[PDB]
Design a protein around this motif. Structure first.
Motif, PDB file in Angstrom:
ATOM      1  N   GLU A 101     -53.215  23.808  -9.352  1.00  0.00           N
ATOM      2  CA  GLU A 101     -52.126  23.761 -10.329  1.00  0.00           C
ATOM      3  C   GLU A 101     -50.950  22.897  -9.877  1.00  0.00           C
ATOM      4  O   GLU A 101     -49.806  23.369  -9.862  1.00  0.00           O
ATOM      5  CB  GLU A 101     -51.634  25.177 -10.629  1.00  0.00           C
ATOM      6  N   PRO A 102     -51.192  21.643  -9.490  1.00  0.00           N
ATOM      7  CA  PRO A 102     -50.117  20.797  -8.933  1.00  0.00           C
ATOM      8  C   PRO A 102     -48.867  20.691  -9.789  1.00  0.00           C
ATOM      9  O   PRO A 102     -47.752  20.579  -9.266  1.00  0.00           O
ATOM     10  CB  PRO A 102     -50.806  19.440  -8.782  1.00  0.00           C
ATOM     11  N   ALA A 103     -49.040  20.696 -11.107  1.00  0.00           N
ATOM     12  CA  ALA A 103     -47.928  20.667 -12.048  1.00  0.00           C
ATOM     13  C   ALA A 103     -46.991  21.859 -11.936  1.00  0.00           C
ATOM     14  O   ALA A 103     -45.867  21.787 -12.443  1.00  0.00           O
ATOM     15  CB  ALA A 103     -48.479  20.602 -13.466  1.00  0.00           C
ATOM     16  N   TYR A 104     -47.420  22.947 -11.302  1.00  0.00           N
ATOM     17  CA  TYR A 104     -46.577  24.111 -11.081  1.00  0.00           C
ATOM     18  C   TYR A 104     -46.137  24.308  -9.637  1.00  0.00           C
ATOM     19  O   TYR A 104     -45.357  25.229  -9.374  1.00  0.00           O
ATOM     20  CB  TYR A 104     -47.338  25.363 -11.529  1.00  0.00           C
ATOM     21  N   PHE A 105     -46.591  23.473  -8.706  1.00  0.00           N
ATOM     22  CA  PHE A 105     -46.284  23.611  -7.285  1.00  0.00           C
ATOM     23  C   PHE A 105     -45.657  22.387  -6.634  1.00  0.00           C
ATOM     24  O   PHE A 105     -44.885  22.546  -5.687  1.00  0.00           O
ATOM     25  CB  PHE A 105     -47.561  23.981  -6.526  1.00  0.00           C
ATOM     26  N   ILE A 106     -45.951  21.183  -7.104  1.00  0.00           N
ATOM     27  CA  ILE A 106     -45.317  19.965  -6.605  1.00  0.00           C
ATOM     28  C   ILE A 106     -43.891  19.743  -7.109  1.00  0.00           C
ATOM     29  O   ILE A 106     -43.020  19.407  -6.292  1.00  0.00           O
ATOM     30  CB  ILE A 106     -46.195  18.746  -6.933  1.00  0.00           C
ATOM     31  N   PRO A 107     -43.587  19.888  -8.398  1.00  0.00           N
ATOM     32  CA  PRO A 107     -42.191  19.761  -8.859  1.00  0.00           C
ATOM     33  C   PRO A 107     -41.206  20.680  -8.152  1.00  0.00           C
ATOM     34  O   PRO A 107     -40.061  20.266  -7.911  1.00  0.00           O
ATOM     35  CB  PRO A 107     -42.288  20.105 -10.350  1.00  0.00           C
ATOM     36  N   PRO A 108     -41.565  21.925  -7.818  1.00  0.00           N
ATOM     37  CA  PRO A 108     -40.662  22.700  -6.947  1.00  0.00           C
ATOM     38  C   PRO A 108     -40.633  22.303  -5.482  1.00  0.00           C
ATOM     39  O   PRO A 108     -39.565  22.406  -4.867  1.00  0.00           O
ATOM     40  CB  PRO A 108     -41.178  24.133  -7.105  1.00  0.00           C
ATOM     41  N   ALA A 109     -41.736  21.836  -4.899  1.00  0.00           N
ATOM     42  CA  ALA A 109     -41.686  21.403  -3.504  1.00  0.00           C
ATOM     43  C   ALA A 109     -40.793  20.185  -3.314  1.00  0.00           C
ATOM     44  O   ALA A 109     -40.026  20.116  -2.348  1.00  0.00           O
ATOM     45  CB  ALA A 109     -43.093  21.114  -2.996  1.00  0.00           C
ATOM     46  N   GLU A 110     -40.844  19.235  -4.241  1.00  0.00           N
ATOM     47  CA  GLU A 110     -39.885  18.141  -4.215  1.00  0.00           C
ATOM     48  C   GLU A 110     -38.467  18.615  -4.507  1.00  0.00           C
ATOM     49  O   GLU A 110     -37.511  18.081  -3.938  1.00  0.00           O
ATOM     50  CB  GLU A 110     -40.325  17.055  -5.192  1.00  0.00           C
ATOM     51  N   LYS A 111     -38.312  19.643  -5.339  1.00  0.00           N
ATOM     52  CA  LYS A 111     -36.996  20.226  -5.588  1.00  0.00           C
ATOM     53  C   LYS A 111     -36.425  20.911  -4.355  1.00  0.00           C
ATOM     54  O   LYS A 111     -35.202  20.982  -4.201  1.00  0.00           O
ATOM     55  CB  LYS A 111     -37.062  21.203  -6.759  1.00  0.00           C
ATOM     56  N   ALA A 112     -37.284  21.414  -3.476  1.00  0.00           N
ATOM     57  CA  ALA A 112     -36.826  21.866  -2.166  1.00  0.00           C
ATOM     58  C   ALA A 112     -36.382  20.691  -1.311  1.00  0.00           C
ATOM     59  O   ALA A 112     -35.272  20.689  -0.764  1.00  0.00           O
ATOM     60  CB  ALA A 112     -37.947  22.619  -1.457  1.00  0.00           C
ATOM     61  N   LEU A 113     -37.236  19.686  -1.191  1.00  0.00           N
ATOM     62  CA  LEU A 113     -36.957  18.558  -0.318  1.00  0.00           C
ATOM     63  C   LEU A 113     -35.709  17.806  -0.761  1.00  0.00           C
ATOM     64  O   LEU A 113     -34.893  17.394   0.072  1.00  0.00           O
ATOM     65  CB  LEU A 113     -38.169  17.636  -0.326  1.00  0.00           C
ATOM     66  N   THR A 114     -35.534  17.634  -2.070  1.00  0.00           N
ATOM     67  CA  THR A 114     -34.312  17.042  -2.601  1.00  0.00           C
ATOM     68  C   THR A 114     -33.044  17.820  -2.273  1.00  0.00           C
ATOM     69  O   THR A 114     -31.961  17.229  -2.332  1.00  0.00           O
ATOM     70  CB  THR A 114     -34.405  16.916  -4.117  1.00  0.00           C
ATOM     71  N   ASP A 115     -33.131  19.114  -1.937  1.00  0.00           N
ATOM     72  CA  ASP A 115     -31.988  19.812  -1.355  1.00  0.00           C
ATOM     73  C   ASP A 115     -32.059  19.950   0.157  1.00  0.00           C
ATOM     74  O   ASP A 115     -31.036  20.242   0.785  1.00  0.00           O
ATOM     75  CB  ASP A 115     -31.875  21.209  -1.973  1.00  0.00           C
ATOM     76  N   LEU A 116     -33.223  19.726   0.761  1.00  0.00           N
ATOM     77  CA  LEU A 116     -33.280  19.614   2.213  1.00  0.00           C
ATOM     78  C   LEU A 116     -32.611  18.328   2.670  1.00  0.00           C
ATOM     79  O   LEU A 116     -31.863  18.313   3.654  1.00  0.00           O
ATOM     80  CB  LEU A 116     -34.724  19.676   2.701  1.00  0.00           C
ATOM     81  N   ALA A 117     -32.890  17.241   1.955  1.00  0.00           N
ATOM     82  CA  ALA A 117     -32.216  15.968   2.164  1.00  0.00           C
ATOM     83  C   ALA A 117     -30.708  16.071   2.008  1.00  0.00           C
ATOM     84  O   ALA A 117     -29.959  15.493   2.802  1.00  0.00           O
ATOM     85  CB  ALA A 117     -32.770  14.941   1.187  1.00  0.00           C
ATOM     86  N   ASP A 118     -30.236  16.818   1.012  1.00  0.00           N
ATOM     87  CA  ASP A 118     -28.803  17.044   0.898  1.00  0.00           C
ATOM     88  C   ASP A 118     -28.260  17.934   2.008  1.00  0.00           C
ATOM     89  O   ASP A 118     -27.060  17.884   2.296  1.00  0.00           O
ATOM     90  CB  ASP A 118     -28.484  17.667  -0.454  1.00  0.00           C
TER      91      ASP A 118
END
Ligand SMILES: Nc1ncnc2c1ncn2[C@@H]1O[C@H](COP(=O)(O)OP(=O)(O)O)[C@@H](O)[C@H]1O
Ligand SMILES: Nc1ncnc2c1ncn2[C@@H]1O[C@H](COP(=O)(O)OP(=O)(O)O)[C@@H](O)[C@H]1O
Lengths: 157, 605, 48
Positions: free
Chosen positions: B76-93
């Protein structure tokens, strides 16, 4: 110049084939009766089919079974040969290499190569592979040189 | 975005944050990017007075860590990749805190059943993650795409902006928003477009067909369309062996909407792309070096016997001929390829011709090279059914109504070409090689195309004596059976003999038997660091040697068995330069010229 | 019989493998099964 191939083809025949067999014999009066009477026993009265069936009760393998046996033994086995057998082959090569040089010393221009030696190491081991054996012995190799020299007697003539 | 995140999303994020807290190798890597960009930003900002935001995830690190999150990305990548990048986009911040864009993901490893050839990529498991291997077969002209559009309201000096979304920007089928490009203000005023305050991204699609050696041969090729976002656009080209990973979306609504059959448009969103190496490919092996692997090279480089052992370790499958494979090793090293100021480039690649009695290794030696050179292509010569190994036919039916494709030698632009049965290959190629050999440029002048393309590459020739066999009691030129210029164009001509004997022939049996009953992987890493780092200048201790020998052979050999030309002056330089590369020498030394002489003594006499 | 079994297929570590298969040539005046013997081989042998 000529159509088709050229004498160059003298190389690819002797260098790249592991055995060459030259098979003509001259109208022997009994042979052409022997083969003829066998070939009559093919076309009707089926006596060879009968014999092959009876020999399927006796000692022959039926085509479908020989195929399955081949594919089994082809895949199941990855053989090797012992150095005990191996020494016989150099003992053969050095002599045949040493002898037939004389015939090119005499410039008869006909050969004896490691392409043929490396063929023998395969015919020996395939002959030993029929047995379902991982290993091979002079018990097989002495038959392979006897089979091989039937080819060299065709190369020289 | 506008909707309130549900726990089915909030959990996925914080669960992925415990992974990255555990495996610091990713937290410090994203930091390492904004280290790199700010150094360049400082370089631009503070002297005149990027890396494309993605990370590769080892899926081995997920399996042992979070079994259901393993199946989530796959199933189910459509339900697990968009949040993992949403984590990384705040890990980067979280890693940065300097003042002041998306961050993205990629994967590596084993996917089990989900790694399959496009022969068996099927309309089962569409939404699941996939990996596919094959040939990249064509590439689309890399178009720019709109995302943000910017406008000016001259009656006020305000600026207005609009933002676009579509089928390829989210894995989930977001509600479509067919917004209209704004040519008039809400108030009714005119507008103008601020091109370049607007933002753009590259679109590309590339079509991958099953790799032809795994293919159940006889069948037709089968191929599927891969779309690449901004990053990977630069790292595919037609004919290379490529692995892709992505989501095999099945988008649109054909038939069931609109009116009428052919089903849904199926494609992969490419989130990872790798080139890979297989036999006769347009890319190098490119093995990575550790700081340990370089240490072993530097242990070796000062030992005064490496070239003898390295020359031998190539080809244990063959007896003798060290005096030749020395040179083939030197072909892998090559020259310096000096390019002169305001004047034409000067050859570095050394091109070798093998000839001898047909019993010999000529055809087999080249399958070391083709298996162990950094980049190589093999051609039969006769059987180059195009224009040749170089140029190609040129026509199109697609939107642009022309295209170009490259022959083997244009593809092998720096490395090796294995040419065998060389004197079968007809004049149509031989005269084209005379163009190449010392100019390393190719020209064609078709109806539309009138232009020059490079071919800075190196050649082995393998040939047969036309009379079927040769011996040195027969005059030694006519057996070569080629125009005298080719006997000049190739730099070293080696004549291999087997008028039979017994004494040397004695040992051969036990060596072959031992062969039926130093090492390769270091040589690649030895050659590429030598090739990349080392560029030997000449030295006066060796510049005299090449004058002494060259000037003598033109007195002697023009009275003996072989021709000598100013072409064979430079071959002394290259071979000296190559051996200095074997030394990793910062400069040439006299020993290298004595080696250059020795190889030609064996090759000529 | 020695042919259909293959032979010493050898993946030497440098990659320069040697063929296990064997090559056999029949030569002669026509007749004498030099063409026929292939036809039966095309029955018995796998993927002939
Ligand atoms: N110098 C050599 N040492 C060992 N084997 C050789 C040598 N030269 C040829 N061979 C044998 O020849 C076979 C490869 O064919 P080759 O003779 O290279 O064909 P070509 O004549 O077309 O180059 C290999 O099985 C190899 O054992
Ligand atoms: N040893 C044999 N036993 C039986 N029949 C044979 C033999 N040799 C040749 N023949 C006959 O020869 C015919 C096949 O001809 P063939 O030799 O295969 O053609 P070619 O001469 O082109 O090889 C068959 O009809 C077969 O009866």
């Amino acid at each position: 110049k000529s159509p088709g191939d050229n004498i160059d083809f003298q190389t690819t025949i002797l260098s790249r084939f592991d055995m060459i067999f030259i098979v003509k014999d001259d109208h022997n009066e009994e042979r052409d009766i022997s083969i003829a009477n066998h070939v009559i026993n093919i076309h009707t009265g089926n006596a060879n089919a009968m014999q092959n069936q009876q020999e399927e009760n006796g000692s022959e393998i039926s085509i479908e079974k020989m195929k399955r046996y081949i594919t089994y033994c082809r895949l199941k086995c990855a053989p090797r040969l012992s150095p005990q057998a191996a020494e016989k082959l150099s003992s053969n090569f050095v002599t045949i290499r040493k002898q037939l040089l004389i015939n090119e010393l005499e410039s008869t221009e006909r050969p004896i190569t490691i392409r043929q030696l490396e063929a023998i190491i395969r015919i020996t081991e395939s002959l030993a592979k029929l047995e379902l054996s991982p290993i091979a012995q002079e018990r097989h190799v002495d038959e392979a040189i006897r089979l091989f020299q039937a080819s060299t007697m065709d190369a020289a003539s | 975005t506008f909707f309130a995140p549900d726990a089915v999303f909030g959990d996925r994020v914080r669960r992925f944050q415990e992974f990255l807290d555990t495996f610091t190798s990713y937290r410090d890597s994203v930091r390492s990017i904004q280290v790199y960009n700010s150094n360049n930003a400082a370089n631009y900002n503070d002297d005149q007075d990027i890396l494309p935001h993605r990370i590769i995830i080892s899926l081995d690190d997920l399996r042992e860590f979070d079994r259901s999150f393993w199946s989530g990305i796959l199933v189910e990548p459509a339900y697990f990749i968009p949040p993992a990048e949403k984590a990384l986009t705040d890990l980067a911040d979280s890693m940065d805190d300097v003042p002041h864009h998306p961050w993205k993901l990629s994967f590596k490893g084993s996917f089990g059943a989900h790694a399959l050839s496009p022969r068996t990529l099927t309309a089962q498991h569409l939404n699941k993650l996939v990996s596919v291997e094959g040939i990249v077969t064509k590439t689309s002209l890399v178009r720019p795409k709109l995302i943000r559009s910017v406008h000016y309201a001259a009656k006020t000096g305000r600026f207005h902006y609009r933002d676009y979304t579509d089928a390829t920007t989210t894995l989930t089928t977001r509600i479509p928003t067919p917004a209209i490009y704004p040519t008039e203000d809400t108030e009714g005023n005119k507008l103008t477009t601020e091109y370049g305050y607007s933002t753009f991204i590259d679109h590309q699609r590339i079509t991958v067909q099953e790799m032809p050696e795994m293919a159940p041969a006889g069948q037709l090729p089968r191929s599927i369309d891969v779309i690449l976002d901004d990053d990977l656009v630069d790292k595919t080209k037609p004919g290379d062996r490529v692995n892709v990973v992505g989501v095999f979306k099945s988008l649109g609504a054909g038939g069931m909407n609109q009116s009428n059959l052919i089903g849904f448009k199926t494609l992969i969103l490419g989130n990872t792309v790798y080139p890979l190496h297989a036999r006769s490919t347009g890319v190098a092996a490119r093995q990575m070096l550790t700081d340990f692997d370089i240490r072993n090279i530097n242990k070796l480089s000062k030992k005064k016997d490496i070239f003898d052992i390295l020359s031998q370790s190539l080809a244990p499958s063959i007896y003798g001929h060290d005096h030749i494979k020395k040179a083939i090793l030197l072909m892998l090293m090559g020259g310096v390829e000096k390019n002169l100021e305001n004047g034409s480039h000067l050859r570095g690649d050394i091109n070798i011709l093998m000839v001898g009695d047909p019993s010999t290794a000529k055809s087999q030696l080249l399958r070391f090279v083709l298996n162990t050179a950094s980049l190589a292509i093999a051609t039969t010569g006769r059987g180059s059914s195009g224009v040749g190994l170089t140029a190609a036919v040129t026509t199109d039916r697609e939107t642009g109504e022309r295209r170009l494709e490259a022959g083997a030698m244009v593809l092998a632009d720096r490395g090796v070409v294995c040419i065998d049965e060389f004197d079968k290959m007809t004049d149509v190629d031989r005269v084209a090689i005379h163009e190449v050999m010392e100019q390393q440029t190719v020209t064609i002048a078709k109806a539309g195309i009138h232009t020059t393309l490079n071919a800075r590459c190196s050649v082995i020739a393998a040939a047969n004596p036309v009379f079927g066999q040769y011996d040195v009691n027969r005059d030694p030129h006519q057996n070569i059976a080629l125009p005298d210029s080719l006997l000049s164009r190739f730099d070293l001509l080696f004549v291999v003999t087997d008028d039979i004997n017994e004494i040397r022939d004695r040992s051969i049996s036990e060596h072959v038997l031992r062969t039926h009953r130093v090492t390769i992987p270091f040589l690649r890493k030895y050659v590429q660091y030598a090739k990349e780092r080392v560029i030997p200048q000449l030295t006066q201790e060796a510049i005299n040697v090449i004058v002494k020998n060259y000037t003598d052979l033109r007195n002697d050999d023009n009275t003996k068995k072989s021709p000598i030309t100013a072409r064979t002056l430079e071959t002394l330089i290259r071979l000296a330069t190559a051996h200095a590369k074997v030394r990793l020498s910062k400069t040439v030394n006299k020993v290298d010229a004595k080696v250059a002489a020795n190889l030609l003594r064996f090759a000529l006499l | 019989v020695c042919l259909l079994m293959g032979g010493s297929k050898k993946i030497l570590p440098d990659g320069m493998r040697l063929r296990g298969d064997i090559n056999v040539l029949l030569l002669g005046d026509p007749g004498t099964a030099k063409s026929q013997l292939l036809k039966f081989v095309e029955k018995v042998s796998p993927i002939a």
